[PDB]
Amino acid sequence: EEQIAEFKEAFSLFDKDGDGTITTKELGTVMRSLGQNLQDMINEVDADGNGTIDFPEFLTMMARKMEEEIREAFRVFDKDGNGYISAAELRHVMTNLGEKLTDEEVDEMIREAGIDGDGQVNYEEFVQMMTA
Amino acid sequence: EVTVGKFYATFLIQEYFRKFKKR
Ligand SMILES: [Ca+2]
Ligand SMILES: [Ca+2]
Ligand SMILES: [Ca+2]
Secondary structure, eight states, X not given: OHHHHHHHHHHHHHOSSOSSEEOXXXXXXXXXXXXXXXXXXXXXXXXXXXXXXXXXXXXXXXXXXXXXXXXXXXXXXXXXXXXXXXXXXXXXXXXXXXXXXXXXXHHHHHHHTTOOSSOOOOHHHHHHHHOO | OHHHHHHHXXXXXXXXXXXXXXX
């Protein structure tokens, strides 16, 4: 139940432009931000076969995944591959991923407040939005 | 699976943020 919302938040981080689909370029920027260096990844989840991943397909893959997954996570965070995650390597991945989620949270706050890009608010609307 | 594990890697860090927020 509540896990679907968490999966939607994981989906929205990849779907930066918010069109409802994860492109191969949108999947590539996050992988590069994790220190990694692609078409098979998209094709492995695309059930409709249009070349992009929508949320229902992302839900099936993430739900079907729920040991070995944490090992792959350890490998991604262990950048130099020395068998340990140092303070700098943990900080780097969590700062990069944390800042990107903050950006997604900002875009959701702007869309929710009716500005939704290229919009504006005067002082009266700013006070109403920034209080209560 | 390295593919789903890569997608799961971001989810784990995201869940660590959420669990740390409720504290
Ligand atoms: Ca997109
Ligand atoms: Ca699709
Ligand atoms: Ca290391």
